């Protein structure tokens, strides 16, 4: 068995809480509940190995920006989440990536780029621009929709795979 510490990092209202609920509880959260810091643990089988997931759902607001340093140190891998409809979230990803590198002080940290709200018809972020950003970072890009549970398992499992590499 292994324990993987996964941290969901993202702007406010990007679907970090909704993604985490879908993986753990297999249910979609309709209403908007702001997060400070929420932790979940789940036993799953990935690629024929049973591994415990430590999932940390972090706060998108700068109000709890103080907690950012502590969670970046402890977490083995990060899920950087942006909303496909919201351009600001996409731009904010760079700040989070730099902070993770700065706190970790390593060029190579397991990371996965997630574009949420795939189901939303009005998409302001092209798949290709996100893919280009992912390529520069050297990490995978996954399009995930919490509402339809599309790619949710893939994004978290991909990150566990990234953790295995280092």
């Amino acid at each position: 068995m292994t324990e993987y510490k996964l941290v969901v990092v993202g702007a406010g209202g990007v679907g970090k809480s909704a993604l985490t609920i879908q993986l753990i509880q297999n249910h979609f959260v309709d209403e908007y509940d702001p997060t400070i810091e929420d932790s979940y643990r789940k036993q799953v089988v990935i690629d024929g190995e049973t591994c415990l997931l430590d999932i940390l759902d972090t706060a998108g607001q700068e109000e709890y920006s103080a907690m950012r340093d502590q969670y970046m140190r402890t977490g083995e891998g990060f899920l950087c989440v942006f909303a496909i409809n919201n351009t600001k979230s996409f731009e904010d990803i760079h700040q989070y990536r730099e902070q993770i590198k700065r706190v970790k002080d390593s060029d190579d940290v397991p990371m996965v780029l997630v574009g949420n709200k795939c189901d939303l018809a009005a998409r302001t972020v092209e798949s290709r621009q996100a893919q280009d950003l992912a390529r520069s970072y050297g990490i995978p890009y996954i399009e995930t929709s919490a509402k339809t549970r599309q790619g949710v398992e893939d994004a978290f499992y991909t990150l566990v795979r990234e953790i295995r590499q280092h």
Binding site: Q25, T35, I36, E37, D38, S39, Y40, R41, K42, A59, Y64, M67, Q70
Partner: protein, 349 residues
């Protein structure tokens, strides 16, 4: 105002960051934790905030009625840390075989234990507690816990003390949400109630509906000794139900004149109005409770108060057909009022 606290729920394998208000009762913080856990836990009322065992200290459940500010936070963590745990028996400085503990808590053995409590076999109860039995459980059929059942027996002080020394939580609620203090009050078991209070049980414990033991006594009537005992131990007045009835409203509706007099002596707000704007005196007028209305007027209730229908108590009495009661209200003069000679004295503990 409120502060960020990390609450760990080991049964759920979850942690949540809540803003909790240190200037409010622990009960209020517990409510906030229960809400944010949208997935209700089983027998949620028994779950309590928990101070995790630290260095040179033991684990302890937070007191529901004590203010949250009374428990200063552990500074070991960057954020204060509490846990939400079921109120299981605490075997502090105790280590026993998992199967042996499992053998002790079989359905049959728990039923045997409840039979000992019912038969008042104090020594046999104590021996089982000494061996590690957890008294914080429910009988499947009755819904009682050992402490709540003991609180309904005659001469219960020995059982109550033995159960508390053996780890019974004083606020462990029954399947219906009543604590031992509620049960003793409802049964008008004054001996059991006094011992529970002596053991440190709070007089303001809330049930599932948020009603206190004192509120139940006012609804129940009968021997008013338990009502007086609660009030003497600084039981809080002014509890409201969903419709805004306070203790005096209930006492008046049912004509529990002894309960009313105790409540009034200990400071009950006569001018409190419910959802309809009715004061206790309006309630007397609605239910033709002349014995109660006389006490209210005598002790200085304001007969001029209008409900939200713009009706006085007098006018309510007339509309309800209580003409004799209405004349008592009408006839009353301010000079008739006799304020209480003495203020209350309260129990030391």
């Amino acid at each position: 105002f409120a502060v960020v606290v990390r609450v760990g729920i080991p049964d759920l394998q979850q942690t949540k960051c809540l803003r909790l208000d240190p200037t409010a009762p622990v009960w209020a913080a517990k409510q906030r934790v229960l809400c944010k856990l949208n997935h209700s836990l089983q027998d949620a009322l028994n779950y309590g905030l928990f101070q995790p065992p630290s260095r040179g200290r033991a684990g302890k459940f937070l007191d529901e009625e004590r203010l949250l500010q009374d428990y200063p936070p552990n500074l070991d963590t960057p954020l204060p840390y509490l846990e939400f745990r079921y109120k299981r028996r605490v075997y502090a400085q105790n280590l026993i075989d998992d199967k042996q503990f499992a053998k002790l808590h079989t359905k049959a053995n728990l039923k045997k234990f409840m039979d000992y409590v019912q038969l008042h076999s104090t020594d046999k109860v104590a021996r089982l507690l000494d061996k590690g039995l957890d008294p914080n459980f429910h009988d499947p059929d009755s819904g009682e816990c050992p402490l709540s059942l003991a609180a309904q027996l005659d001469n219960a002080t020995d059982l109550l003390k033995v159960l508390r020394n053996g780890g019974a939580h004083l606020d462990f609620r029954t399947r219906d949400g009543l604590t031992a203090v509620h049960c003793a009050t409802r049964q008008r078991n004054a001996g059991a109630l006094t011992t529970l209070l002596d053991l440190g049980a709070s007089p303001d414990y809330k049930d599932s509906r948020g009603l206190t033991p004192l509120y139940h006594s006012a609804l129940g009537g009968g021997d008013a000794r338990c009502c007086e005992l609660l009030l003497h131990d600084h039981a809080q007045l002014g509890t409201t139900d969903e419709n805004g009835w306070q203790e005096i409203h209930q006492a008046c509706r049912f004509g529990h004149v002894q309960h009313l007099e105790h409540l009034l002596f200990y400071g009950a707000n006569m001018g409190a109005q419910n959802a309809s704007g009715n004061t206790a005196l309006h309630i007397c007028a609605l239910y033709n409770q002349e014995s109660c209305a006389r006490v209210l007027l005598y002790r200085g209730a304001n007969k001029d108060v209008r409900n939200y229908n713009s009706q006085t108590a007098f006018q309510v009495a007339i509309i309800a057909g209580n003409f004799e009661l209405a004349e008592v209200i009408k006839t009353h003069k301010d000079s008739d009022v006799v304020p209480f000679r003495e203020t209350p004295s309260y129990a030391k503990r």
